[PDB]
Amino acid sequence: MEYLIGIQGPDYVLVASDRVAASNIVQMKDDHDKMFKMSEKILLLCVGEAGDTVQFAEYIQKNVQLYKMRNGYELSPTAAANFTRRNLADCLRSRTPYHVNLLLAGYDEHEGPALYYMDYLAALAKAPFAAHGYGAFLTLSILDRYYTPTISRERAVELLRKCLEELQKRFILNLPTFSVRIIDKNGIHDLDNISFPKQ
Amino acid sequence: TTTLAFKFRHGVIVAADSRATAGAYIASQTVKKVIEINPYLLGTMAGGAADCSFWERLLARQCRIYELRNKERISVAAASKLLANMVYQYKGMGLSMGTMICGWDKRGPGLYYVDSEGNRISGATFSVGSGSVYAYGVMDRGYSYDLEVEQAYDLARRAIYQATYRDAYSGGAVNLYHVREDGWIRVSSDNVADLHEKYSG
Amino acid sequence: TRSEYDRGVNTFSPEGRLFQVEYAIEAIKLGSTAIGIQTSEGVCLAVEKRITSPLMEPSSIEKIVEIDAHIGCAMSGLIKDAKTLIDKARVETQNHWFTYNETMTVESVTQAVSNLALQFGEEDADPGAMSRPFGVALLFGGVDEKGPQLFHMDPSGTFVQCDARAIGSASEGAQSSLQEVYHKSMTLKEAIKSSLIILKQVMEEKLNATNIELATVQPGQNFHMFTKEELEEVIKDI
Amino acid sequence: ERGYSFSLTTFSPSGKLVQIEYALAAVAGGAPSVGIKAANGVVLATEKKQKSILYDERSVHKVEPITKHIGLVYSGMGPDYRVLVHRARKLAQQYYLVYQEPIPTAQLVQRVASVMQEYTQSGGVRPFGVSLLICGWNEGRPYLFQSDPSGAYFAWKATAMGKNYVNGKTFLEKRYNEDLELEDAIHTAILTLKESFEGQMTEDNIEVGICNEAGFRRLTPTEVKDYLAAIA
Amino acid sequence: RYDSRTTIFSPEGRLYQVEYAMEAIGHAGTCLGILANDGVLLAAERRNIHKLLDEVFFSEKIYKLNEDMACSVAGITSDANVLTNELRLIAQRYLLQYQEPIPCEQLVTALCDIKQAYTQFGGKRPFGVSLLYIGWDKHYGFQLYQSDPSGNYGGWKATCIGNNSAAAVSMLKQDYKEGEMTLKSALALAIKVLNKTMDVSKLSAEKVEIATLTRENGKTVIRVLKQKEVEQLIKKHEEEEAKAEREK
Amino acid sequence: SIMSYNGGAVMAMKGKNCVAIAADRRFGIQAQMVTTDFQKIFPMGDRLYIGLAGLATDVQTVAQRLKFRLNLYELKEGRQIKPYTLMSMVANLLYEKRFGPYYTEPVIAGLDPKTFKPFICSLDLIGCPMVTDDFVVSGTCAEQMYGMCESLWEPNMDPDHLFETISQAMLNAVDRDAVSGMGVIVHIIEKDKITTRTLKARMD
Amino acid sequence: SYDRAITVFSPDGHLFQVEYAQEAVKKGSTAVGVRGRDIVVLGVEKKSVAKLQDERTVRKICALDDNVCMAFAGLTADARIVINRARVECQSHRLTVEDPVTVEYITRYIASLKQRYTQSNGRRPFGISALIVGFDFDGTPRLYQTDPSGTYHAWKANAIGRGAKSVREFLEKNYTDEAIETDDLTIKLVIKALLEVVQSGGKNIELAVMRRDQSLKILNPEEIEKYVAEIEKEKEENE
Amino acid sequence: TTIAGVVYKDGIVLGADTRATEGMVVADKNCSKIHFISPNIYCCGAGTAADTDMTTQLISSNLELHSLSTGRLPRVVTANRMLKQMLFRYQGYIGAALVLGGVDVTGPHLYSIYPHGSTDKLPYVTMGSGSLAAMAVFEDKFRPDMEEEEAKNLVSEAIAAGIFNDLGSGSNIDLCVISKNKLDFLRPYTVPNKKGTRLGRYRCEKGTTAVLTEKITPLE
Amino acid sequence: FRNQYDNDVTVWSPQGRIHQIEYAMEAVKQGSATVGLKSKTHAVLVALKRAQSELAAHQKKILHVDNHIGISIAGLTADARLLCNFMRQECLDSRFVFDRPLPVSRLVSLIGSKTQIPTQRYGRRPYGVGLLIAGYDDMGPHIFQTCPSANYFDCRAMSIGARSQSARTYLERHMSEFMECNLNELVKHGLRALRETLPAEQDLTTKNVSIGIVGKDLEFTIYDDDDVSPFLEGLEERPQ
């Protein structure tokens, strides 16, 4: 399924995602965005069951912006992660459960960067790394054997490039293009994608 | 069903067959798929026919209320999101929907695809229904963002006939619409047989 | 001793009058003058703006609004009261265009709005509704299967088909003038000229472009509110 | 000031709710009751005197237990006292069910105070015309509390409310000492009942309950008669 | 007149019931708090200690709400208890939902919203309780907020509420050096204010209720001054007053 | 098989005037492995700790509502929660949803606040309270740890001996199962110090 | 009589409780907002904090959404409640339609909320008037005044609270098309209107400027001294 | 699980096991199944342990409230009526097999409610998985109008046959005796099988386990 | 004020009257007159239409509820309209569940039950509308007059409203022909009744009268200025 690679640097998190939208037979949109801007210092990545993903993501997004606007300051990324976890857990046992996996990664001035994992049951997890979708099994081995606690930005893009090209070689369907972003003291910034010739 | 709607520099077209079937026997061959919900906003057809008609008529009521309350025409994005939410609370107990929200507003000609499953996705090329893949192949072979109005019309008719010809659950008539800053227009309606004669040679 | 019966709408006077409803009726005279006239060619609605300050945005003050492209409205009374009334009327017209997929007649429009009205003393207000009579008099005009039709609505919920009705502060005088100035064969242009004549005779200030809002509904076109240039054209003759 | 002594949801321009004060005045007119906290336990007593000896004194009891170690006495209305007992029992037993542990008396007083102040929240329902005396022993400590019709609750080394409560309070503050023993506490309580009993207490004319490490128990008529004879 | 239920508007616009709920705090016990450079404290008066109160309590006018939240109360006892319980409920609901101690401003605004809702509508008498919340938050360090039965609030570095509150706060602002008091000088200032505002020539430590909030070693500790500690502080201020007068 | 959907392994131990609680660190879905920082052991006090076994998100939810209600109780009473009240409290928290049961089987351990007598307790999915004088385990490794703690435990076990016994028991028990493993956290708490450790077992 | 009842018409057809709530705004504080070509400005008189109040929490000007702001005059608790409700509604509107809330929609919601709070007994009307400002999607400058009666109106530059009549006349006499040519001219007009009633200057004034989607920053108390230096400079310049 | 109940000449004797099993693995060997309700009535539960526990505390609290409101000792018919009403309220969704026996002003009484919610008054009755062996003994050796000590050993050998004919019961025996002037809560009455002695020390001394990191936090 | 006994329907006078109910009764005396007549097989409702001004239409006083049953209102517009929607809903419910027309007596009984609740319970104002009910069922035509005191009467005729005593005494003079009259005869009798109600300066014009007729085979049909024209052509001249 759709991919979400978030890796935590010494003072940054590099979060990555694909840009493919398909309905069970073919890619309708070639520039899909499954990543949502929680605030200036936090972003959300939600995948899994489609349709539920988008409205749930905007509901959480508007909840967190409601918070940052009613109080004048945005949540800490850990607080936002726990908020989303509580919301989805409360809606879990309800008669309309939300079977959507999720990722959450951001930065805080007081402590530093953070990254959080959510299944379609939404149990929390903080790691210097994260992956979602059916390719997660494929690139988890790269994620482990190709990671050090001191990933540098250029080596970070090289490592995500390695994971990306292993997806392109191994994963069954086609992932043409990828969104990857840097989160640091200056906030959120967007980086480029990859492509591969076959001629 | 088979609906194709692709966006280009000049505007957006929409495709529609007219064959309605209940299993094997064709229920009707004179079905208007794309709904003239609003004079500047167009809605498409897929899934349950009555589900689509009811939901699009609800959306038409909603946009008329919006344009009469806010005294401004509703955004295409707003209409697509409204459709998505109003059908979402119905998700899970028997809804069958797939629909394109197509129209031109202040943010340029817009197109979004809504469905019972839950995707409200934008994008240039939209094809849903039985012959969605057949239309997708010909369009992606022929899609260029720079299709001029007459050539866009010609390639539109070409791709739509290819779609209605390659499918087995499609037939009857053809519905074609174009969207511009003054609203939508009914371009043409060419039958399967006459257009067969035209496109055989 | 009336004082024991004005307190509350559910009281009956010794003369059997609804004093709360009568007070709501008289509260219409607090609003600005609105004049609507019915002609074979259509209906035109003329109103006074009563602009408080030149810095005001004239688009904000709404004396005439559209419930549907085929029908028109005029207001006199509380702004918020009429806002709820007009929103309900628009919701109802879309309800009809949903249920029967047709354009619903102006008499039925005033029927439904009066159904929302006269509901102040109704137990169905448990979810929340008017505990007090609605405080705006409504002027409904438009074209339906019976041709051009104009209906005047009373905050009590009563409606009457009127060829030419005037509501607002100068309802009595404007009605008296319309009584002799109205003829059955009056054309739309001469009817609108007469309406602005009555407004000039009635309004507290001079007639300029920012003193009058003008509306027209004809079988041919849809609801048209006179623009600045159209208002200037129709006022330069007078 | 008169237009504000008619509802429980309107503040008097100077002070506070006057209906609460009137409920307190109803309390001060009730049967005198005295509670005393000794070093090792607590004792609370009241006078059951009523005309027409035809009345069955055993039929009703002014001192009732809430649980195995909590007892209460009142001063003021009777039926309101019964209702308060019912609500207190329900609340204490709910706490027991939730926590499977005997209810601490401080929490019981807090909850009963909340329930009685609930009746003071809105109009149409009068506040309880009853003040409560709560006796309890827990964590090696005897607790004595007073619950108010206003929902206020406070502690008391030894207090007395009801009829002639000021004289009883003066007597207690001129009698009570921090090192008092349980039996001497009962003696002081019966003496406090006496100094304004007005009519020669009998074994059944008064009613006294006692709580200690062994829980709370209302004294039987025989022990009451023995203590009355000992005091004489 | 317009002294009926709170959902009324005087022709001049005044909400008379809310006004009376305001002036009613003047009948409550005097309690204050001030903001020190590296500490915050709450000082309160024990107006009712006649002879025989068991003092089976941790604090009467000061009520703790959370590992980080503490407040002082001034109003009717019933509304006081209700307000404290709702404070606990809201603070811990925020903690459960967000897995972070509630910011002082957010909890204060929550209480203020409840209090306003109790005077905005419903025909219910407004909570006649004025609160002095004390607490710490990573967003602004040490903060002190003064509630209000009307439903308003304010951030203050020095505020007294209760009987004789006007004179107390006037002299407090007369003798406040912002940004340059530690905990010790703040304690001395609070004790002097109590000396001037209470109706006693020598206030007893029993009549005084002081709780101090301080952040250290990564954790915020809320402690009420023990009897030994409060008596030492009052005796120190007493000999300090003696020093001031003998020098005078 | 709901237990196998996420799994886990917790154990509680007590000794002479001290308590030791141990828990697994693995977090993973029914088939695939994701993280190793899952928190099954939670501090209900300075000397009170609760271990949870069940669905991961159900574990976190019950832990958070427990912390909320426990802070409510602590604020209401002002006293430290005595662990039998904690066991009845957790039993109620699970049981109050009998028709909607949380498929979570938790565990608690601690000491009496006054006499410093250690106490442990066991809870069932639908909330059956249970207390043992020796030991208690929960998770997917119930059989192995049960058997070898029966064969290994001795009464009146000294604090250093308590730490050694809990460490050996938990490690050699987790060597016998796969879904729960790859790192175990061990918390020994005594009335004087709280030494928080993590024994070095296999990372496999 | 007819005054102590929210939903009782007077014999002369007035809901006197509504007008009394409206008059309650006149006892608030002056708050004037002007919309320019690319800017909208909010000038409010600030209560001089005596010695101890934390000005961070005395917020008179608050933003409902990233595209709308508002200043209020009236009871602060009512203003806080309406602020919370209106920003919650902005977020829910973005939930329903995904696009930024237009000023008309949020002003209509605020007016409808106040109205539903002033049509039944047991519900006291919101005795606050709020000046709604913001830009639409196409960046058109719009400013709205909401009245405790539950109505709203579009104002190019309005003032509320005490002395609002004097500021109204000042704006009538000074609002010109060229007075909004530049941001600095709009600022000069708004500070002039403010100092009309708060003549002390310097402090006791708060300003906020919204340009074409800058997520307005309130003018911080470093260039209010600079901007008032500019104001005094232009003031001694024409005289 | 085994619950048994007899009426003897003067009162009631109750016998309960102590083995609690989840699935096919025993959970605990010394669970308490004799449940305190009243100082004059007692109950034994079987089936879902949590359901038995919670229903027993609920009925005990309600019955304590009843007795305190009345001031009289509660009667068995009252307790069983509320118990059966609340059991039938859930209509078998609770797997709680309880047996209720006690003494009132009318004499000894003993009732047995199956998990579905049916009851009957019996001089002698048992339930549970090991109910077969207990009731076989109940027909084999039981005698009515039979004295206290012989009641004790009767119930003891009945529960002994239960434990030695069923896996889900044993390792302790506890008895509750009800009388108009006696309440004997024997717990344990007699342990039937003590765990065997351990022959080999597994040698768990110091230094046998390595650790990753240290962290010291003092308290008190 | 000794009339503190007329501020709500739930208090009795010291003399045992509900003055609020009496005021509601007198309320329908304000509305315009309306008289009904019934033949062997035909029942007529004739009312005097009133207009706010001559430049506007006359207020409708004859309301159609069902093909066989018809009503005429005199009093508050709001209460009468609400009663009319209630009537229509009940008649439809009867047609749906029983497939038979609602009996006139049964309809009026449910009307009384519905309108008694405001009279008995605090809350809704008493229904101050005088209703004239004319329908057809098994035993022929019925005329039912439902007084706003939640009471109803089976009447040969009734005039309710302003100056209705003149029509009442006209019908009191003219019983002897009502039973045996045909359509035209009863219509002219009713028109003479209204003309008795109407003063000298005014006459029953086309816009002034509203006529509703029901019968065994003829549905409840209401006539207007052009429709009342044939019926008023047979009308005689006013005996002035």
XYZ file of N, CA and C in Angstrom, chain F residues 57-132:
228
model
N -3.664 -1.336 22.322
C -4.441 -0.113 22.496
C -5.430 -0.244 23.644
N -5.988 -1.438 23.848
C -6.815 -1.651 25.030
C -5.994 -1.486 26.300
N -4.753 -1.979 26.292
C -3.867 -1.801 27.441
C -3.650 -0.319 27.714
N -3.336 0.450 26.670
C -3.079 1.871 26.878
C -4.330 2.604 27.351
N -5.495 2.279 26.782
C -6.728 2.932 27.210
C -7.026 2.641 28.672
N -6.954 1.369 29.078
C -7.276 1.055 30.465
C -6.253 1.687 31.399
N -4.985 1.742 30.983
C -3.973 2.407 31.797
C -4.291 3.884 31.974
N -4.716 4.549 30.900
C -4.947 5.987 30.982
C -6.197 6.312 31.791
N -7.288 5.575 31.574
C -8.474 5.807 32.394
C -8.207 5.452 33.852
N -7.392 4.421 34.098
C -6.974 4.111 35.459
C -6.192 5.251 36.084
N -5.251 5.838 35.344
C -4.483 6.948 35.893
C -5.389 8.138 36.182
N -6.334 8.409 35.280
C -7.292 9.490 35.492
C -8.097 9.269 36.769
N -8.704 8.089 36.905
C -9.540 7.819 38.070
C -8.709 7.740 39.345
N -7.465 7.269 39.243
C -6.607 7.169 40.416
C -6.159 8.536 40.900
N -5.820 9.442 39.983
C -5.518 10.806 40.395
C -6.754 11.484 40.966
N -7.932 11.187 40.405
C -9.172 11.669 41.009
C -9.302 11.201 42.451
N -9.098 9.906 42.691
C -9.206 9.382 44.048
C -8.153 9.992 44.961
N -6.923 10.131 44.471
C -5.856 10.679 45.299
C -6.139 12.127 45.667
N -6.702 12.894 44.734
C -7.072 14.271 45.036
C -8.258 14.327 45.991
N -9.219 13.415 45.829
C -10.384 13.391 46.705
C -9.997 13.039 48.135
N -9.089 12.081 48.303
C -8.719 11.594 49.625
C -7.484 12.295 50.176
N -6.524 12.616 49.312
C -5.267 13.179 49.749
C -4.265 12.161 50.245
N -4.626 10.884 50.264
C -3.770 9.823 50.765
C -3.293 8.932 49.625
N -2.180 8.246 49.869
C -1.687 7.259 48.922
C -2.647 6.077 48.848
N -2.858 5.584 47.635
C -3.832 4.526 47.409
C -3.250 3.198 47.878
N -3.938 2.557 48.812
C -3.467 1.284 49.344
C -3.827 0.153 48.383
N -2.883 -0.734 48.062
C -2.991 -1.520 46.818
C -4.214 -2.419 46.716
N -4.827 -2.829 47.826
C -6.056 -3.612 47.708
C -7.193 -2.766 47.145
N -7.250 -1.488 47.524
C -8.178 -0.580 46.863
C -7.862 -0.487 45.380
N -6.576 -0.513 45.025
C -6.205 -0.487 43.616
C -6.699 -1.731 42.889
N -6.581 -2.903 43.517
C -7.025 -4.124 42.852
C -8.539 -4.136 42.680
N -9.284 -3.708 43.701
C -10.732 -3.624 43.537
C -11.097 -2.582 42.489
N -10.327 -1.497 42.427
C -10.588 -0.427 41.477
C -10.383 -0.900 40.046
N -9.286 -1.618 39.797
C -9.046 -2.131 38.454
C -10.069 -3.203 38.107
N -10.469 -4.024 39.084
C -11.507 -5.012 38.820
C -12.801 -4.336 38.397
N -13.177 -3.255 39.082
C -14.365 -2.512 38.676
C -14.190 -1.881 37.302
N -13.008 -1.324 37.024
C -12.802 -0.666 35.738
C -12.965 -1.650 34.592
N -12.484 -2.882 34.768
C -12.717 -3.884 33.731
C -14.166 -4.356 33.709
N -14.760 -4.615 34.875
C -16.064 -5.263 34.911
C -17.190 -4.346 34.449
N -17.063 -3.029 34.635
C -18.177 -2.124 34.353
C -18.592 -2.154 32.885
N -17.889 -2.937 32.071
C -18.188 -3.119 30.655
C -18.290 -4.603 30.331
N -19.068 -5.330 31.139
C -19.138 -6.784 31.010
C -19.654 -7.202 29.637
N -20.649 -6.491 29.110
C -21.200 -6.827 27.803
C -20.363 -6.286 26.650
N -19.392 -5.423 26.934
C -18.499 -4.884 25.936
C -17.043 -5.125 26.288
N -16.719 -6.340 26.735
C -15.492 -6.539 27.517
C -14.242 -6.096 26.774
N -13.341 -5.452 27.507
C -11.990 -5.217 27.017
C -11.177 -6.486 27.215
N -10.683 -7.050 26.115
C -9.978 -8.330 26.147
C -8.553 -8.128 26.674
N -8.482 -7.658 27.917
C -7.236 -7.256 28.554
C -7.143 -7.892 29.933
N -6.008 -8.535 30.213
C -5.818 -9.246 31.470
C -4.666 -8.615 32.234
N -4.926 -7.659 33.121
C -3.851 -6.901 33.763
C -3.361 -7.543 35.059
N -2.410 -6.859 35.693
C -1.783 -7.350 36.917
C -1.244 -6.154 37.692
N -1.225 -6.270 39.023
C -0.722 -5.203 39.881
C 0.204 -5.790 40.939
N 1.020 -4.913 41.524
C 1.935 -5.280 42.596
C 2.332 -4.022 43.357
N 2.635 -4.182 44.639
C 3.018 -3.043 45.448
C 3.285 -3.445 46.881
N 3.227 -2.452 47.767
C 3.426 -2.655 49.195
C 2.376 -1.887 49.987
N 2.102 -2.366 51.195
C 1.184 -1.662 52.083
C 1.824 -0.364 52.560
N 1.119 0.767 52.485
C 1.765 2.056 52.787
C 2.208 2.205 54.231
N 1.582 1.494 55.170
C 1.862 1.679 56.590
C 2.908 0.697 57.109
N 2.630 -0.601 57.022
C 3.534 -1.619 57.539
C 4.535 -2.105 56.502
N 4.512 -1.536 55.296
C 5.472 -1.862 54.240
C 5.427 -3.348 53.889
N 4.246 -3.943 53.996
C 4.086 -5.343 53.637
C 3.807 -5.427 52.142
N 4.658 -6.090 51.359
C 4.428 -6.155 49.911
C 3.134 -6.886 49.584
N 2.502 -6.472 48.491
C 1.271 -7.107 48.051
C 1.249 -7.116 46.531
N 0.798 -8.238 45.971
C 0.609 -8.376 44.535
C -0.797 -8.905 44.296
N -1.294 -8.681 43.084
C -2.633 -9.125 42.733
C -2.680 -9.469 41.256
N -3.675 -10.266 40.885
C -3.897 -10.692 39.513
C -5.333 -10.401 39.110
N -5.513 -9.997 37.857
C -6.823 -9.659 37.327
C -7.056 -10.430 36.039
N -8.324 -10.700 35.756
C -8.709 -11.485 34.596
C -9.266 -10.551 33.519
N -9.442 -11.076 32.303
C -9.948 -10.285 31.185
C -11.255 -9.588 31.543
N -12.228 -10.338 32.052
C -13.516 -9.766 32.426
C -13.432 -9.254 33.859
N -12.260 -9.388 34.474
C -12.022 -8.759 35.757
C -12.246 -9.633 36.972
N -11.683 -10.838 36.971
C -11.728 -11.661 38.172
C -10.534 -11.331 39.055
N -10.763 -10.768 40.237
C -9.642 -10.458 41.128
C -9.013 -11.728 41.673
N -7.697 -11.686 41.851
C -6.961 -12.812 42.405
C -5.648 -12.318 42.990
N -5.274 -12.880 44.135
C -4.069 -12.487 44.852
C -3.285 -13.741 45.205
N -1.966 -13.670 45.055
C -1.082 -14.772 45.390
C -0.016 -14.282 46.357
